[PDB]
Symmetry: C3
Subunit: 285 residues, 3 copies
Amino acid sequence: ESVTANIENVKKVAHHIQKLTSIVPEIGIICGSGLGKLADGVKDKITIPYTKIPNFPQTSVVGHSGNLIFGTLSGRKVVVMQGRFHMYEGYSNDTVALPIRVMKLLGVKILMVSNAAGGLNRSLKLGDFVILKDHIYLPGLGLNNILVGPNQEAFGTRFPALSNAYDRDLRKLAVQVAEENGFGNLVHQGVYVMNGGPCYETPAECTMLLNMGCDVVGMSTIPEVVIARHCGIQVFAVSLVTNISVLDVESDLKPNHEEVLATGAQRAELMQSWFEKIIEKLPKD
Amino acid sequence: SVTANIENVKKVAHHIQKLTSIVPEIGIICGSGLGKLADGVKDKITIPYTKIPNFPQTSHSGNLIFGTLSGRKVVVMQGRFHMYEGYSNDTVALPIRVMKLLGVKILMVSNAAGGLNRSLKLGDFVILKDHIYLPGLGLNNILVGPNQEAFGTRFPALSNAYDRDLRKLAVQVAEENGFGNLVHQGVYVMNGGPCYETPAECTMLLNMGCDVVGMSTIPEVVIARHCGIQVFAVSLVTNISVLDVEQRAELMQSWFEKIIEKLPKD
Amino acid sequence: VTANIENVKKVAHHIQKLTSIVPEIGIICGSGLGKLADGVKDKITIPYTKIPNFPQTSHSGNLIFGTLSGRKVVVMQGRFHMYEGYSNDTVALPIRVMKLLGVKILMVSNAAGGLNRSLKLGDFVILKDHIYLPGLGLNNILVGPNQEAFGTRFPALSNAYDRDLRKLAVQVAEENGFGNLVHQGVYVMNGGPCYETPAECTMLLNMGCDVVGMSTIPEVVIARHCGIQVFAVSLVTNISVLDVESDLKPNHEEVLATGAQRAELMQSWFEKIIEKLPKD
Ligand SMILES: Nc1[nH]c(=O)[nH]c(=O)c1Br
Ligand SMILES: Nc1[nH]c(=O)[nH]c(=O)c1Br
Ligand SMILES: Nc1[nH]c(=O)[nH]c(=O)c1Br
């Protein structure tokens, strides 16, 4: 489980970070599919490798450590997480939760996140943006909920509600910004379902998930969202449709990570612009 | 914690049998309204979990309460062990297996649940007639691990898990006492928890054929059926699930008491 | 013991010192395949107990090497089901060893409940797809660091049940007079060890599932991950009870009996399939 995401450990990490930077983030951004360039474009940044933060969880992309990036974006103070902790990697609940709880103590009020997802809904097109308006946490309904274990009262309640988990005001703003900027047609809202992974979904699985009312399927994000809502951080989440789910076994169509990465790199520029323009218009401030 | 094997369970049961002469035939786990019941058991002996070696401990320390209720010898279990708290399979199972060794023939369980079925109202009683054990189908079944053969078989059937005869009687008792309009029978689905269910989740669960949702009870029911204890269980509907993002306690304890009065006795 | 390239090579090498047979087909005995090892000619039998670091399972399991239908095979007698408490690495290691040993095709049988209302006791349901409930729910056998010598981080499962093998299996059945017994269907894994409730069966049927069992999928995922072609068949050992009022119920002794009844046929079917596999 590594180090417990309790108030004492989370404070020690926040304080270490606060010695490394004077940027107090209002907005946290977890870089997923399509956000690689956003991460790169933060103004007046300070980059802190995970390896330099005692008790911060460790992750790499082929040996290269993840980073926390502080600075501004559209004139608002941000922390960007470049490097995520996916459960199919075997990370514990505490490992995944600790960074989100650190954001809470640093001052984050709003969390923005992207991911790659397979398009289940038959109206979706490759490269579409699907704003999350709800989710189905399959691991969580099992006994693999990120909050399973003693509750950390300092951060939230034993039985958190997930009613308005995907803040309806942030969703309205995101849609407006897309419409205003000419790409409203690329933007949908939908139900995201988590497959613990790391296998792509079989056609029978995709058919089942579609019939359950799911619009997109992915392997990430929900656990971070749950920790965020648990501690009162407002959440905005987007899936980039990186492949269209195959519903028939007798198809030679096949999911592959290469094409998922490619759709991500191709949409990165537009996704960056969307996020920067949302941020410019975020409520208050 | 300690493996819920026959030796560890025998140890605990044998200890309790030195503290009470009461051989319980009915076991009761009050989840929803109340406690109380326990309200009312006579000639009672109260045993803190903390005074029972190798017994699981709460995280108000729980109690086993022995005595007579509606003329029958009972053990009431006050203080539950839920999987969302992080308890192990063995921890959750041990208390139920201890009941088996003490003489328990019938387990009666109450809980609070969210109403999925759109015909349900706040305060309705939903007798479980079946369940969907999501964690169990997903490789988190309380029986995963070596089978404890002294207690039951490797692949238990869950046919008549919620004894149909006990359900008929419970319905008869409710109807005789004028609250039969509050009683439904339904399928309970376990959400591992501890998050409440999203509207998308609730919609899927309803469409899976589920009537109520909760985070408990099924693990205990599985262990009870595995060792041949008959089960009766009821959900109190304590909220109505939202499907789109866009003193009842006292009636229940009274119902349980009146059922026990009419239970068969060997 | 991690199912990584180092540990798996060590096991494979030990095995290679005990047999010169380089298997091209690996077979996992489940329901109906009890007799299969007996047909194996020029066989050597290697108890799991005699293989350092190979996982161990109860009257010790065996690896049987030899010739079946003119082809080199390794038969696995004794499996590792997740409801017994086995680890991901424990289940995956034997499959990865098969791969290092030269296996190109895995054939597997299992017992399953018949969800599809047209199924009959003793029918054969060739798997053409699956629903891995434990895998959707974060208990996927591949969870953890990906072992790159074996395969990719995100394996696809689109033709997991090799269609061509499926076509041959059906052809063999039809030409041998038991085509009426054979179906193709979707298998759903229940992590187990409980039989499914009536409400659970109804839900699974409505999910598009034809049969339900507690095995096989984890091994299939590992095989596919390392590029082994898979053929898998469920024997319908009991008809799922969907009606909570019903008197019918699954009985494990009847399940065993049904599987054993079909053993001779299942054997013949597998042998005749292997006989017709394209060789070069
Ligand atoms: N990027 C994708 N594509 C897919 O088909 N299923 C998934 O879980 C992810 Br992540
Ligand atoms: N009491 C409730 N209400 C609900 O909507 N969901 C639950 O899991 C429980 Br417990
Ligand atoms: N043999 C069976 N029968 C059934 O109804 N469910 C199962 O999971 C297995 Br294995």
